[PDB]
Amino acid sequence: QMPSLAPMLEKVMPSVVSINVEGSTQKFMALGSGVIIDADKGYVVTNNHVVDNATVIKVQLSDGRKFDAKMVGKDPRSDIALIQIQNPKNLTAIKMADSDALRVGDYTVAIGNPFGLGETVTSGIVSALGRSGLNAENYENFIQTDAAINRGNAGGALVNLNGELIGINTAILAPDGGNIGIGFAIPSNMVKNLTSQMVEYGQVKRGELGIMGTELNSELAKAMKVDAQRGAFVSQVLPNSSAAKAGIKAGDVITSLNGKPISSFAALRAQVGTMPVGSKLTLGLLRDGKQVNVNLELQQSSQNQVDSSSIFNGIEGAEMSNKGKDQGVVVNNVKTGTPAAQIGLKKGDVIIGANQQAVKNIAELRKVLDSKPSVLALNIQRGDSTIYLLMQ
């Protein structure tokens, strides 16, 4: 006869986990949380800032069991990393909710490991949607909540009353490292995109529309005679970009992405910046007082991602990324005094295998390294020649 979050939590808690990390860049220990996304494969989502530069990562279930997990993907821009429990047995995954349907008045419960105390559940409400600005270079469209969140909670779950995952708790405005009623979480629709990508490739292939923009405030809207105090203001479209071909002109106000109204430029960025190259979307435009509807196809890009350090753990040097279909890892740009280039690693190389194993993309490459060989025999291709780079 007493209302309680107990029943829903009895089913959902096994899905959340605590993560222990051991790394070096100097030795360090870190701790946070993670959410089991796929029970069978043992995929566990979490903040990239928790497992970053980790030599060893161990996952601990709510029932006590400890497992070892290895990395599979990690996107610093959105701060979402995907690890995988080695030897997954009898896990429970969380079902994901559609974050686009969240409304500010909604209830929320957060689950995670504050200060290593163990699985802690605290509750509150959605205080705001679309918050961004914490770190202006990243993609951020944070859900804001007043459910208590402290250090240890990162990577943990943020669920609705029905037990569905709506976000991953990431950060907190807070002077003197102590929760104050203001916490942030990446919405779940982003986790579902960034994550599935990582599963199938090892990195996120970022697509761009090709427009330069800025937040459309009330002042700029007067100067530009537009009845709208919020939205994405198009500064200029790039030549031969998706937006160009679609018909978007500078001085345009983007007001909606796929039926959904667009809080601001930051969200629009985070939205498409989370979609995979080739996705078909439709933008809601506003040029010279008239409404407009256009169809776009996200295209390639020049996304700065996966550095030779995120896959080698310590091997400073050229950045790397997938190449076309599963054609292998490509070495983006080699620096100079960076250790990677100090082993024959030159920009333009295409790692097509390692230790007699084929490397179609970053995921597979990280698989060979997962076994931890004593000597890594890279089979790359420079121009029209096949060569071999050795390591230890």
Query: Which region holds residue 218: left if phi is over 0, alpha if psi is between -120 and 50, else beta?
Result: alpha
The reply on whether position 173 binds a second copy by CB under 8 A is yes
Question: What Rg value do the Cα atoms of the chain yield, rounded?
Answer: 22
Nearest approach in angstroms of CB 226 to a second copy is 9
The region of 235-243, 293-301, 312-320, 329-337 touching a second copy under the rule CB under 8 A is 235-243
For a second copy, how many residues bind (rule: CB under 8 A)? 60
The reply on whether position 56 binds a second copy by CB under 8 A is no
The reply on whether position 28 binds a second copy by CB under 8 A is no
What is the spatial distance between Cα 18 and Cα 47, in angstroms, rounded to a whole number? 12
What is the spatial distance between Cα 120 and Cα 17, in angstroms, rounded to a whole number? 10
Nearest approach in angstroms of CB 206 to a second copy is 24
Judged by CB, which is closer to a second copy: 40, or 63? 63
Check if the beta carbon of residue 170 is closer than 8 Å to that of residue 142: yes
Nearest approach in angstroms of CB 87 to a second copy is 13
Check if the beta carbon of residue 71 is closer than 8 Å to that of residue 23: no
The reply on whether position 65 binds a second copy by CB under 8 A is yes
The reply on whether position 179 binds a second copy by CB under 8 A is yes
In Å, the largest CA–CA distance within the chain is: 75
Among 3, 105, 177, 337, binds a second copy (CB under 8 A): 177
Among 258, 279, 300, 355, binds a second copy (CB under 8 A): 355
The reply on whether position 358 binds a second copy by CB under 8 A is no
Judged by CB, which is closer to a second copy: 80, or 148? 148
The reply on whether position 178 binds a second copy by CB under 8 A is yes
Nearest approach in angstroms of CB 176 to a second copy is 5
Nearest approach in angstroms of CB 361 to a second copy is 20
- Tokens representing 260 are 């959904």
Among 3, 7, 105, 239, binds a second copy (CB under 8 A): 239
The region of 34-42, 64-72, 73-81, 301-309 touching a second copy under the rule CB under 8 A is 64-72
Among 102, 149, 232, 253, binds a second copy (CB under 8 A): 149
The reply on whether position 117 binds a second copy by CB under 8 A is yes
Among 135, 295, 333, 386, binds a second copy (CB under 8 A): 386
Residue type, 313: N
Binding site for a second copy (CB under 8 A): 60, 63-66, 114-115, 117, 120, 122, 148-150, 173-182, 212, 214, 217-220, 222-225, 228-230, 234-237, 239, 249-251, 355-356, 373-377, 379, 384-390, 392
